[PDB]
Structure 1
Amino acid sequence: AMKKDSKAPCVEVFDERDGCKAAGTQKASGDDGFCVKVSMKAIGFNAAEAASVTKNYGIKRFGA
Structure 2
Amino acid sequence: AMKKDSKAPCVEVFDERDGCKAAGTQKASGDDGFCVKVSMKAIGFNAAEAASVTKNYGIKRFGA
| TM-score normalised over the length of structure 2 | 0.99
Aligned residues: 64
Please name the residue that 1:8 is paired with. Answer: 8
TM-superposed CA distance for 1:31, in Å, is 1.7
| TM-score normalised over the length of structure 1 | 0.99
Which secondary structure does the structure 1 equivalent of 2:36 belong to? strand
TM-superposed CA distance for 1:33, in Å, is 0.4
Runs of 4+ in 1 over 4 A off after TM superposition: none
TM-superposed CA distance for 1:8, in Å, is 0.1
Identity %, equivalent residues:
100
Q: Output the aligned Cα RMSD.
A: 0.3
TM-superposed CA distance for 1:27, in Å, is 0.1
The 2-side partners of 1:33 and 1:61 are apart by 34
Unaligned runs of 5+ in 1: none
The 2-side partners of 1:26 and 1:55 are apart by 42
Unaligned runs of 5+ in 2: none
The 2-side partners of 1:31 and 1:45 are apart by 37
Q: Counterparts in 2 of 1:27-42, with a 5 A limit?
A: 27-42=27-42
TM-superposed CA distance for 1:26, in Å, is 0.2
Which secondary structure does the structure 1 equivalent of 2:37 belong to? strand
